[PDB]
Design a protein around this ligand. Structure first.
Ligand SMILES: Cc1cccc(Cl)c1NC(=O)c1cnc(Nc2cccc(C(=O)NC3CCNCC3)c2)s1
Length: 273
């Protein structure tokens, strides 16, 4: 089912990711000139469960075909080490990207990133795939600024996780919507750490007591309203991803709607005579 690629078509050029069981490489793929790819390996000695999880991720990604979901090129399973080969996202993980490009984008660009992520999540949820770990660190960015959801499989990141998922392990597309709200806040803040220095227990306590992340600086009122509704305690009151995509598409198509900003509560006062 998945395209099987011969090892002689794959050149690993540089490590770009953390590797217990293997590494993630930037490389080139023969398929016409070579195309850049990302390459994930599974080193000899892997267990049965590691093999199932590894090839499981490629199995899941091969079932998807969407602009905002990482595209699978193929696998090496007949030879060792085994490999998963995907498109190469030139700008890396979204969280690191925003932190290293602080203030460099327009509000419309930032909201377009969110629309892309939302479109990918709507596709995943409609396909009956619950991500469970939606966060900017799991979004990849290419040279067109397109954001793609990544990190698939099954087998807790507290400050991204909905209360019902923390409290009793109920992970659904509605808990992914909560996470998407955190991702909205990450994007509009250029990669700020959610809840800043609060401990995990302090975050859970604050959420359970009704507190929510404050408005980012320079944040459209419509965008803050939307992320606040992603954070409703009652799951059934959260927007569906179809609602999120619709709202973001309308804001982008009428971009003056983004010029109305939510008030920012300053932590500091500077007074000048
Ligand atoms: C290969 C694979 C197997 C299973 C699942 C997935 Cl999602 C993938 N694909 C990937 O992990 C990746 C696809 N594209 C990736 N691009 C990526 C990731 C991390 C860093 C960079 C990267 O080049 N980052 C910096 C860019 C600017 N400064 C220099 C380096 C690129 S990783």
């Amino acid at each position: 089912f998945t395209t099987e690629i011969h090892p002689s078509c794959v050149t690993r050029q540089k490590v770009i990711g953390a590797g217990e069981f293997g590494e993630v490489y930037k490389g080139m793929l023969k398929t016409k000139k070579e195309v850049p790819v990302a390459i994930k390996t599974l080193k000899a000695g892997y267990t049965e469960k590691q093999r199932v999880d590894f090839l499981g991720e490629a199995g899941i990604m091969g079932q998807f075909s969407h602009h905002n979901i990482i595209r699978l090129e193929g696998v090496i399973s007949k030879y060792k080490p085994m490999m998963i080969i995907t498109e190469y996202m030139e700008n890396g993980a979204l969280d690191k990207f925003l932190r290293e490009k602080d203030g460099e984008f327009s509000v419309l660009q930032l909201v377009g990133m969110l629309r892309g992520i939302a479109a990918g999540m709507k596709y995943l949820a409609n396909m009956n795939y619950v991500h469970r770990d939606l966060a900017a660190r799991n979004i990849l960015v290419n040279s067109n600024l397109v954001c793609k959801v990544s990190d698939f499989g099954l087998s807790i990141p507290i400050r991204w996780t909905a209360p019902e998922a923390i409290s009793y392990r109920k992970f659904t597309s509605a808990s992914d919507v909560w996470s998407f709200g955190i991702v909205m806040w990450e994007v509009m803040t250029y990669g700020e750490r959610p809840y800043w220095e609060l401990s995990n227990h302090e975050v859970m306590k604050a959420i359970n007591d009704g507190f929510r992340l404050p408005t980012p600086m320079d944040c459209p009122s419509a965008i803050y309203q939307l992320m606040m509704q992603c954070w409703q305690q009652e799951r059934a009151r959260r927007p569906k991803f179809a609602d999120i995509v619709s709202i973001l598409d309308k804001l982008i198509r009428a971009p003056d709607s983004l010029k109305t900003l939510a008030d920012f509560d300053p932590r500091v006062s500077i007074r000048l005579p």
